[PDB]
Design a protein around this ligand. Structure first.
Ligand SMILES: OC[C@H]1O[C@@H](O)[C@H](O)[C@@H](O)[C@H]1O
Ligand SMILES: OC[C@H]1O[C@@H](O)[C@H](O)[C@@H](O)[C@H]1O
Ligand SMILES: OC[C@H]1O[C@@H](O)[C@H](O)[C@@H](O)[C@H]1O
Ligand SMILES: OC[C@H]1O[C@@H](O)[C@H](O)[C@@H](O)[C@H]1O
Lengths: 17, 133, 17, 133, 133, 19, 133, 17
C-alpha cells in the first residue's frame, strides 16, 4: 500500500517513452 | 452545529483536533495530501473553548490510517462524538476524549481515508469519511 | 452526469440529522 | 521534453493551451475543480515561443468534457501532439493546431477527466488523462 | 474457522443466513447481482447445526443496503460475530443472533456493498465487506 | 450508490458506428 | 446490429474473435475472470459466416491488456470496426481484420479493461470498454 | 500492477487473526 490514492490513467498519446 | 465538508484528496498528512476529558471532541482540522503537496483544510472549530489540542503528524505516505474508532453518546442532551482513536500501520494515536457510550470502529482492509466531513457545535456532532483505492 | 468526481463515503457516526 | 504531472482532482474548470498552426501544441495549463473551489494548475511551457493562446472556460459543473480528440505526428523529427479538440456536452472547442498525422479520440461514455500529465519540449510530446467516476 | 471470500460483484439480491438466539451467527450465503443476473454465492456453513435460517430477499435494484451493524463477543472462548442487522433504504432486517458484546456499525453515505468475505467455524468468526460506487 | 443498487464503472467508447 | 453488454468483471482470461481480411471484425466473445475463476461470456455472433476465428489466451493474471487499437470505416455502407489489436505487457495479438479507415487506440497507463459492450450485425458495429483499478 | 481488479474492503469485524 502506497499511502496515496490511485486513479485510472489512459494514454499516453504522442511520443512513446 | 455547523456542518463541514472538506471533500476528497490524495491522502492525509496531519490531523489537528481538540478534546475535553469530561465532554467530547471539539475542534477538528486536517492537512491533506494533494498530489504530493500539503493542502491545509479549513479549521473547524467548536462554539466554545476549554479543549485540549493534539497534533497527529503522520509520516506520509509510508504511514497511513488503517482503523478509526471512538465513542458516541449524549452530552447535555446532544448525541456527539465523545472520543476518537486513529490507528496507523505504525502506531496508535488516542483515544482522545471520553471513552464512554456506544463504540464504533472502522478498520480498512484495502483502501485509504482521503477526506472528512461532519458537523461541530459545542462538540463534534457527527462525522463521515471519504474512502478510495 | 454531475460533472464532479465522486467517492465512497462511510458514516455518519454521531448524531443522525 | 520536460515531464509534467498535475495529478488528480474533482473536475475541470478551464484549459489554457497554446498552439501553432504550422507545428503543434505548445503550452498547457489547467484550472481544476477541487471540492468546489478552483485549483490553479502549474503552467507547463514550451521551450520556445510564437504560439497562439486559447482559453477554454467551461461552465463547471454542468458543462464537462465527453470526448478528447486530436492528431499525433512528426515535427522536426519528433513525434508530438499536433492538434487537440475538446468536446463537452455543450459544444466543441477546437481543433487547435495542425489536423494531420495519426488521429486519436477518447470518447467517455461514463466517467470524468480529472487530471492531465505529459511532457513538453518544443511541443507537447505526449499526454495522458486521469479518469474517475 | 474456515475462511471464505466471495469477491466483488455488481450488487446484492438475497442474503441467506442462520443464527442462534443463545450463541451467534452461523451460516452465511449470498445471491449477488452480476451485471443484471443473479450469481449464486457458495454456502458458507457452520460446523454445527441448531441454527434458525432467515432469507433476506431484497427488491433489487430499487432496494439496497445502507447500513450493516451487529455485535462481536466471546462464545465458548472464541471471539465471534454474535449479531447482524441489515438496514436498507426500505426496511430493517434483524437483528439476528445475540445483541450482546461490542457493537459495530457501518453506515454507507455513498456507495454500495458488493461482496463479503470472512470465516466460519462453529460460528461466524469475522467478516469484511467490499465497497464500491 | 446513493441512487441505484447497481455498481458503476468507467466506460470509454464507443468506437465505430455512432448511434 | 444486435446490441450486447457483457458488463464488468475482475479481469480478462481469453478473447475469442473472428475476422475477414476483406471486410471487418465479425464474432466476439470473452472469457472473463470473476474473483479468481473463469466466467464464460456470451458468444456475440455475426449474422453471416466466412470469418477466420482466433483465440487469444492470456496468461492471467501475470499477462493483461495494456492497449487496444484498431480501425473503423465503412463496409457495404455501414460504419463498422474493421480491425482490432490487443497489446499486453507480454506481446501483441493482431491486428485482426482490415487496417483501413480511421485508426483509434486506447493505451492504459494505470488500470484494467474488465468488460466489453457493443453491437454486431454483419460485422462489429461498435464497442466500448469498462475500465477499473 | 496485477491483472486483477481491486475494490475497497472494510473490516474485519470479529476475531482478529
Ligand atoms: O455540539 C452539540 C450542540 O452544540 C450546540 O451549540 C448546537 O446548538 C447544537 O446544534 C449541537 O451542535
Ligand atoms: O517537443 C519536441 C522536442 O523538443 C525538444 O526541445 C526536446 O529536446 C526533445 O526532447 C523533444 O521534447
Ligand atoms: O467459530 C468459533 C471457532 O469454531 C471452532 O470450531 C473452530 O475450530 C475455531 O477455529 C473457531 O472458528
Ligand atoms: O454490421 C453491419 C450491419 O449489418 C446488418 O446486418 C445490420 O442490419 C445493420 O444494422 C448493421 O449492423
Amino acid at each position: 500500500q502506497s499511502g496515496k490514492s490511485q486513479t485510472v490513467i489512459v494514454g499516453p498519446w504522442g511520443a512513446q517513452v | 452545529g455547523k456542518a463541514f465538508d472538506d471533500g476528497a484528496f490524495t491522502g492525509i498528512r496531519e490531523i489537528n483536533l481538540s478534546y475535553n476529558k469530561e465532554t467530547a471532541i471539539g475542534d477538528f482540522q486536517v492537512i491533506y495530501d494533494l498530489n504530493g503537496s500539503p493542502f491545509v483544510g479549513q479549521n473547524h472549530t467548536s462554539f466554545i473553548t476549554g479543549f485540549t489540542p493534539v497534533k497527529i503528524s503522520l509520516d506520509f505516505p509510508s504511514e497511513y490510517i488503517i482503523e478509526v474508532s471512538g465513542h458516541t453518546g449524549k452530552v447535555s442532551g446532544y448525541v456527539v462524538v465523545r472520543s476518537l482513536a486513529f490507528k496507523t500501520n505504525k502506531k496508535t494515536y488516542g483515544p482522545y476524549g471520553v471513552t464512554s457510550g456506544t463504540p464504533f470502529n472502522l478498520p480498512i482492509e484495502n483502501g485509504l481515508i482521503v477526506g472528512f466531513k461532519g458537523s461541530i457545535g459545542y462538540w463534534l456532532d457527527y462525522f463521515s469519511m471519504y474512502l478510495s483505492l
